[PDB]
Design a protein around this ligand. Structure first.
Ligand code: ICS
Ligand code: CLF
Ligand code: CLF
Ligand SMILES: [Fe+3]
Lengths: 522, 477, 522, 478
């Protein structure tokens, strides 16, 4: 039933007695459910060290992964280029998923096409799909560039992207001069970040490989910035803001911040902003190329060093205090620009906030996950805050990266109780937060189910989630945030200390029981 | 708009296409005509999508794993292949259930074989068998396993049927191989059919032909309700208030045991004809169970359905049917009295999958609204036949609409409201057109039944009449 | 007892059994405490409509006010002037409190002096305190200006600030050219916002009244901006940013953003930034003067119009969409500058966020309080979001202001269930949130005790607090936020929608009971 | 590391900034400790007015009465009588912890005020106060007494709150305590303590002089002058009762009016804060013959000495339980020392606080190997300075009613590793790169009293002094 002036959605509608009785009858009648005592027994078992040991013995089964597949990153990379249509050669179901995944994180349109290869292509290949697909895409959506990647079906069948695109131009389906950079992006290799690396390197090759003869390193007095797979609008913006404040000439290579934030003003803009083709063509003339997320830009690095002859600086992601300092000092060295008073003052405002909040942050224990560069920068900043990053999980991490993070941990007393995990998933992490309980999780929306599980054991065992990462689907507009630079460090610090204080308020809100410590001032 | 205006719009939009695509798309766009009732005389459907045109369709894995199998709550469903498909479809569809997740229910979890290149080179059958053992060790209360094949599985020559047969016999477990690779078919639709055949061959054919269950003459199953936001629960309650016993729900909040009891019911009640007509026809042929289509969207259809269902039983059920209608009459009448004046006259365009583009029209009409265009991602001609009966004269019909067509149709027709999916939502909001998601219910619902109509009306009103829509143009332009 | 490697602070130390037993023994033996059944009985009574009626019958008793006293505002106004020392003539206890109050909100030093009038000066006046105090302050702290206000002791005794300052200069305690603007700021009149108006008008007078002969309206091509009592750093910053983006010359009169945000870089800066004396002296040459918080700038308005001959525009505080639009259009009219594309795009990004979040905001019910201009802007923006501001409380509001807010409510369907209260306090508001329960409170840290009270009645009756206002003492760094302009509207919108979704997650986190609605995507 | 001669020239250099009158006055309030001089009245002046315009850290008598002594009493309602500021700025800023149902049977963190308007200045507030009392009784029926805490205007306009308290108290058979703590009285918080003590004596303490129904034991004590900051009094009480004593009353942290009224029945008054409550303690000895004794529960060395000295006032059974308590907690505080003393030893601290802690916490710092190189008080008297020179090291700097400028320049020269002071000081010294701990509010931590408090104190000094933030203030490029 409903009361017209107080309509109930599913929650709390289904808590009405009649729905409750109906659901109990469905269970008892037809579901052959295990008895509640048995469910409780098995749940308790899943929180134990014994279960954790079985859990960590898994070899073949993955449960609740913390990564996606290559083409997702290729799509995000391509979206950062001016009037560029991401085009995934292969099966169309993949493209529905990439678009929806990004739709839900950015709350924005996400344009991408497929060429709709079907079972028949397993006999004759996808060449005709490429010819008609490129022609149809160009005519219908009028991009100035189509950036081609692949789904796993096309990789297994073995379609030669280079040959198919060349023949599409030869046979007149698209103009010869029309830019169609490409990359093979097999989902069974690496993860979404690898697809970003592959797509970027393909676009870089497209515009520079056969024209290096006239290039002179440093001739355009700019620094190239490669952001990698990046899903916070504030991160593209803070980098451009800081370089502009220093008077540093730069080219942000893959810049989707406009197309992922168009105004609702009465018209839909399929394309906005982005890196220009000319910026890619001119990129070898820069002083140098800086990679903001080097641990998933290894192929790009080899190309800019091997072909453009740039000496890519050895810089960590500019997260936290030390690594933002290092980023700006290296940029100052390359460019000849001093670090200006505005950034020096911003830096000292961050340090001030650290002194202001250090007593509530000190010793706080965290489990956290994400992509390798994000994760290591979060670990570094936590150490700088006097926090303990106890469970550090990077599903798509590698041994060399883990050694780097273990070195960072070993250089700080706040790393003494921390372990770095690679190849492990959120079912692994769930075990760790039961057996070695931290104070909070820093992670993406999939962490909400871990928090749910911990609360089920009891309120004293609940581990609250702090949402920093990708994807975030169950809160609105956090994709506008910043995590890089001093600005992002300030935002992270604020979110962390206030999550601590919100939870303390919750635990001290009990009248006469715990509210002796429900202080007005903290 | 006028018939002649709509035909002119179609031709104008199609001018942008290369000739091959223009000729194809023309076949998938039509203007409804009362004189033409057979859709195979006016629109083509269930054909491949044209490359590069930004279809809204998904794949057969979406229709099998995402739609049919994934909701079954006490089984573990393995996304077998590389990591993407299973991650993008993790918990995106609001197929609601009651359970203790990770312990006796598994719906919002992502179990995957996470294929690496070594698995392409050597095959994944050995990995699959080891994975099944690991599932049994860590999730002992699971009541069955399904194997949802992603694109690579068939292409590399793996034999998941042999693995399922061998491991099932070794472990005494129901293990269901499903060849729903996304390269098969042209959309989600073939995934439905593949998934229905897997239920037939591996679940009903393996645990559904000897009773010990206590039957009654009022036993029914809800076929094709995936309980989006609780839709199936807000339907079940009415059927049982009418005196029926809902033995099973396929597949929303569905247990494997209730599915296996279904060959014992007296009547299959089909909501989503597209996705489960196949198994319904099978159960009639093999068990003699009749099936009938019904519609629980809005009071008019819900009342008609309850009466039509009750007429298949006896006088006691028909008496209880009229009791249910009398109970809820003041409730839905209050909803209409409040919301119909706030919505009457407004024009709606819909684009959804295989059922709702026609099934929700009555509910819109119960609020005085007019559906001026509708279409489907993956419907067949039998669906279009049913649609022309529900849609008005001269309305626009589009099959497998392209992104460009949909934008251009909207710009000309200027509907007051659009009901479609997540890939469409943010486009039309930027254009200043109120939008409601008609897959996920925009995180609201249920919309089925009498309790769902209240929520539907609240939702259409909050969005159509919201103050945000008068604010898109700056006063200085 | 303590275990060395997991030391317990008061919470949860005192939940140990030995402390629990000790506290029960203290109560039973010596506290003669009313029995728990009686406490429960009285508590329940305090949540009723019967109690509310008695509560609203108070005339002499105030409980939990939502306002402070005049000199607090005079001090904040004075801090916005370059190298200016706030100086409160009267009793020193007041200055200890003003400083600590702002210290706790800004987490920053707050410099202010007293001239330490004692009971003896209550009989011969405080002239000598002013002479030695001004001389001592100037020599010790080296301000370029001393801005003098009064405590209630000084007002009651009747000290003539003008004569006392003039005599200090006559007798050589401070140089005759040294600026000593003053204002009488009796705490028994108005509230803290009144002290801001009084102090500002006193400073404006000091620098312009006797120099009007050479002034020409519009000759400097600038617009003066008067911010009023403002405790968000982001609000000073967004106004300056928007005017700079528009190319509008402006003078922010009272600008404390630098002295409330000095970097922690190894030195303490008693003064930083601020409006210069030259800017005040030149202000009459501006095109006009815009008051950002007109409902507490009435005295300033009379001086600006009566002496500077400016035609102050009729503008509401620039909060929310419509009122930011109106601010920018009026600034465009005055200055001749068009609204630039950057601000038009920012506006459309706010509108986009509104379309994205409207389904969770719609119909949500709020209780809120604050100062008049802040409250009416929050009310306006809530209506624009489709929210219902049910309980609107302004302790220091007046009848003319309430009529204005009531007219805003009447223009929108979302105001149909809303009431505006003036002269009422947070004990009145506690009653309203029991008898006519809203979904959330928007208010300052004092609201935490209302949330506590509502939870004690039951989780289903709990009204969570969303902290927007002044003072915020129990979270860190929220004073860096923004509430004005499109940027502030974006921040407010995000905070509100995510508070809603956080609460819904809490209510749906119960496994098998309510987690059917614990959606990953919202 | 500064010599007496360097300290002296530091004092002279700093005072060069001042006009002559301020220089001559401030020189009297700054001194270098000398063990050859034990009488503070031969080396430092105190409890005098502040010089105008120098940015004293002091508060006022209302702070000392309402904020300090009366406010914590949990089952009475305390009216801030005057305009709205005093009561609002002092609402819930002091962490005088208590158990109760706030708004129902306890009222500590609430702000009751008469919110004076100009009409009240002109006509007087006595009629408003009587109406306010009736409204309090209607809306807060479980209150067990009312105090009236006068703000500056009350005495200046000739109001008579004593008569109002007399009449309404008789009418309603209720203890209504008039307190003339107007902030223009005295020179600091100190006179507010004394006024507040006299108010308890005159209106509360004698209520049960003629009753004989309380059941006394030989081991009845009262904790005098512990306001339970962050639970300090509870972490002291537990030890006294483990030692076999019965803590009849706590003045006034977590204190009820009844336990105040029962205090004349105890055998011994245990005075922690001498400054704020020596007055009532002397009264109770003279009138009731109750002896009083000073003690110190900061750190294990002082706590152990205090427990033994208190137990020596009773019989062998208490002395035996005393040694049991000491043995019980020995391994616990020893583990705290083992962990934290190496991390803190040799570090130098400057303190500036109110009337007690500037000397009382020194032993706790020394138990962690630290050195207090400077200390001072806002409002202490010469008897406090006498006790301070005994606790402080030779040649250390002492400052009474220090000015903001003085504290800053003293810190710049002495360069302590840690500063312990208040909220108005905290953010200055953090910006200078000097670790800071709040020593009034315990920086929202504590308790610090007793054995359980020492663990928290040690954890807190360590977390701050050794924090990574302090190495980061200088940008690498400067
Ligand atoms: S009462 Fe006094 S200033 Fe003895 S007014 Fe002050 S809670 Fe201080 S050094 Mo705040 S004489 Fe208590 C004090 Fe000491 S408020 Fe607390 S810390 S031990
Ligand atoms: S059409 Fe459908 S969704 Fe596409 S793959 Fe095929 S079954 Fe799956 Fe999963 S992993 Fe990624 S998304 Fe694909 S490319 Fe390899
Ligand atoms: S020295 Fe002390 S704090 Fe000062 S007034 Fe006097 S008792 Fe009080 Fe309350 S209201 Fe404001 S702060 Fe004063 S000026 Fe009128
Ligand atoms: Fe600060």
């Amino acid at each position: 039933s409903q009361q017209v002036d107080k309509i109930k959605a599913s929650y709390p509608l289904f808590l009405d007695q009649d729905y409750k009785d109906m659901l109990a009858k469905k269970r008892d009648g037809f579901e052959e459910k295990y008895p509640q005592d048995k469910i409780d027994e098995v749940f308790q078992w899943t929180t134990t060290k014994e279960y954790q040991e079985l859990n960590f013995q898994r070899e073949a089964l993955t449960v609740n992964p913390a990564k996606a597949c290559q083409p997702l990153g290729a799509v995000l990379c391509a979206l950062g280029f001016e009037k560029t249509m991401p085009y995934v050669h292969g099966s169309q179901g993949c493209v529905a998923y990439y678009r929806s995944y990004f739709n839900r994180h950015f709350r924005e349109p996400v344009s991408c096409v497929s060429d709709s290869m079907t079972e028949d292509a397993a006999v004759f290949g996808g060449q005709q799909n490429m010819k008609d697909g490129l022609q149809n895409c160009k005519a219908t959506y009028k991009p100035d560039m189509i950036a081609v990647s692949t789904t796993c079906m096309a990789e297994v069948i073995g379609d030669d992207l280079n040959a198919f695109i060349n023949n599409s131009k030869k046979e007149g389906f698209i103009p010869d001069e029309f830019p169609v950079p490409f990359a093979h992006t097999p989902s069974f290799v690496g993860s979404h970040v690898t697809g970003w690396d592959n797509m970027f390197e393909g676009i870089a090759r497209y515009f520079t490989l056969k024209s290096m003869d006239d290039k002179v390193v440093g001739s355009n007095k700019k620094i190239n910035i490669v952001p990698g797979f990046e899903t916070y609008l504030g991160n593209f913006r803070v980098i451009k803001r800081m370089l502009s404040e220093m008077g540093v000439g730069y080219s942000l290579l893959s810049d989707p911040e406009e197309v992922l934030d168009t105004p609702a003003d009465g018209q839909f803009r399929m394309y906005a902003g982005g890196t220009t083709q000319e910026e890619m063509k001119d990129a070898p003339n820069a002083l140098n190329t800086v990679l903001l997320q080097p641990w998933h830009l290894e192929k790009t690095k080899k190309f800019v060093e091997g072909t453009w002859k740039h000496e890519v600086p050895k810089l960590n992601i500019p997260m936290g205090l030390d690594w933002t300092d290092e980023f700006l000092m290296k940029v100052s060295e390359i460019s000849g620009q001093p670090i200006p008073a505005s950034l020096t003052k911003e830096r000292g405002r961050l340090v001030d906030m650290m002194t202001d909040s250090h007593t509530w942050l000190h010793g706080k224990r965290f489990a956290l996950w994400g992509d390798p560069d994000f994760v290591m920068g979060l670990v570094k900043f936590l150490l700088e805050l006097g926090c303990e990053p106890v469970h550090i999980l990077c599903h798509n991490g590698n041994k060399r990266w883990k050694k780097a993070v273990d070195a960072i941990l070993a250089a700080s007393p706040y790393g003494k109780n921390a372990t770095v995990y690679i190849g492990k998933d959120l079912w692994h992490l769930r075990s760790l937060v039961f057996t070695d309980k931290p104070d909070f999780m820093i992670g993406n929306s999939y962490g909400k189910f871990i928090q749910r599980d911990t609360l089920h054991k009891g309120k004293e065992f609940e581990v609250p989630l702090i949402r920093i990462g990708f994807p975030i689907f169950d809160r609105h507009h956090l994709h506008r945030s910043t995590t890089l630079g001093y600005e992002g460090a300030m935002q992270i610090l604020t979110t962390l200390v206030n999550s601590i204080l919100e939870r303390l308020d919750e635990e001290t809100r009990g009248m006469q029981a715990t509210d002796y410590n429900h202080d007005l001032v903290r | 708009m006028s018939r002649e205006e709509v035909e002119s719009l179609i031709q104008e939009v199609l001018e942008v296409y290369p000739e091959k695509a223009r000729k194809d798309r023309n076949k998938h766009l039509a203007v409804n005509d009362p004189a033409v009732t057979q859709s195979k005389k006016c629109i083509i459907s269930n054909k491949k999508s044209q490359p590069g045109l930004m279809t809204i369709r998904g794949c057969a894995y979406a229709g099998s794993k995402g739609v049919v199998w994934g909701p079954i709550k006490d089984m573990i469903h393995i996304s077998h292949g590389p990591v993407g498909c299973g991650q993008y479809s993790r918990a995106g569809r609001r197929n609601y259930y009651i359970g203790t997740t990770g312990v006796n229910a598994f719906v919002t979890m992502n179990f995957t074989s996470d294929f690496q290149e070594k698995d392409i080179v050597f095959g994944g059958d050995k990995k699959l068998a080891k994975l099944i053992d690991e599932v049994e060790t860590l999730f002992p209360l699971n009541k069955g396993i399904s194997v949802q094949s992603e694109c690579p599985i068939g292409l590399i020559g793996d034999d998941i049927e042999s693995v399922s047969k061998v491991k099932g016999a070794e472990l005494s477990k129901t293990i269901v191989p499903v060849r729903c690779e996304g390269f098969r078919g042209v959309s989600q639709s073939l995934g439905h059919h593949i998934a229905n055949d897997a239920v037939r061959d591996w679940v009903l054919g393996k645990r559904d032909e000897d009773t010990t269950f206590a039957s009654t003459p009022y036993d029914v199953a809800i076929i094709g309700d995936y309980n989006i936001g609780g839709d199936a629960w807000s339907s079940r309650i009415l059927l049982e208030e009418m005196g029926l016993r809902c033995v099973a729900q396929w597949s929303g909040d569905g247990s494997i045991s209730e599915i296996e009891l279904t060959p014992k019911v007296k009547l299959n009640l089909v909501h989503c004809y597209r996705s489960m007509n196949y198994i319904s026809r099978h159960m009639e042929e093999k068990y003699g169970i009749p099936w009938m289509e019904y519609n629980f969207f809005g009071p008019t259809k819900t009342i008609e359905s309850l009466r039509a269902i009750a007429a298949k039983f006896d006088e006691s059920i028909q008496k209880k049917c009229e009791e249910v209608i009398a109970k809820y009459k003041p409730e839905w009448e209050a909803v209409v009295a409040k919301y119909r004046p706030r919505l009457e006259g407004k024009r709606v365009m819909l684009y959804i999958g295989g059922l709702r583009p026609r099934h929700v029209i009555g509910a819109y009409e119960d609020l005085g609204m007019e559906v001026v265009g509708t279409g489907y991602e993956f419907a067949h001609n039998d669906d279009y036949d049913r649609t022309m009966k529900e849609m008005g004269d001269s309305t626009l019909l589009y099959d497998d609409v392209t992104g460009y067509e949909f934008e251009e149709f909207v710009k000309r027709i200027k509907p007051d409201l659009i009901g479609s999916g997540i890939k469409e939502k943010f486009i039309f909001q930027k254009m200043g057109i109120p939008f409601r998601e008609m897959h996920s219910w925009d995180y609201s619902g249920p919309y089925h039944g009498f309790d769902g109509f209240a929520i539907f009306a609240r939702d259409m009103d909050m969005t159509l009449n919201n103050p945000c829509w008068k604010k898109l143009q700056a006063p200085w332009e």
